[PDB]
Design a binder for this molecule. Structure first.
Ligand SMILES: CC(C)(Sc1ccc(CCN(CCCCC2CCCCC2)C(=O)NC2CCCCC2)cc1)C(=O)O
Length: 135
């Protein structure tokens, strides 16, 4: 029962929305329309995470709209948000299945734990959480 062995972890896989904290507080603060907020907590969207050595891909799926972003780890690359805001940043791995990135005042800390994703964002005095699980 349960057999695995590897040095690093595989980001490659698809994950569905499970749970969330400070979603409305964060979304109202970044200035999202209340339609995208009511559908965003009511409907469970889908996520995908893809790793290609130094390259990295991420698919966001919020009910029907799909956003695809690409970046290269340790190199300056431009990332699109849910509203279409394109912002230059770099993403670093801490060697522990966890990617960290910062734009201005929004502190992203991603974490992968096998079949579970844990995403923790912090914009100023607001602290948004997202949890997803493998499909
Ligand atoms: C159901 C759905 C629609 S799925 C969904 C939606 C949004 C997120 C973002 C959260 N985020 C924080 C950081 C937010 C900025 C991020 C930059 C690159 C990709 C776009 C946004 C993030 O993914 N960080 C890193 C990023 C690329 C490298 C590894 C992960 C994640 C899943 C929902 O959650 O509503």
């Amino acid at each position: 029962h349960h057999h695995h062995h590897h040095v690093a972890m595989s980001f490659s896989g698809k994950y569905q929305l499970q749970s969330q904290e400070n979603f409305e507080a964060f979304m109202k603060a970044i200035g999202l329309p209340e339609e995208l907020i009511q559908k965003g907590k009511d409907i469970k969207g889908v996520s995908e995470i893809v790793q290609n050595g130094k390259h990295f891909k991420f698919t966001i799926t919020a009910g029907s709209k799909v956003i695809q972003n690409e970046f290269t780890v340790g190199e300056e690359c431009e990332l699109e948000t849910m509203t279409g805001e394109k912002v230059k940043t770099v993403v670093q791995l801490e060697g522990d299945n966890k990617l960290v990135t910062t734009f201005k005042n929004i502190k992203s800390v991603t974490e992968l734990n096998g079949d579970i994703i844990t995403n923790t964002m912090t914009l100023g005095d607001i602290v948004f959480k997202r949890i997803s699980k493998r499909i």
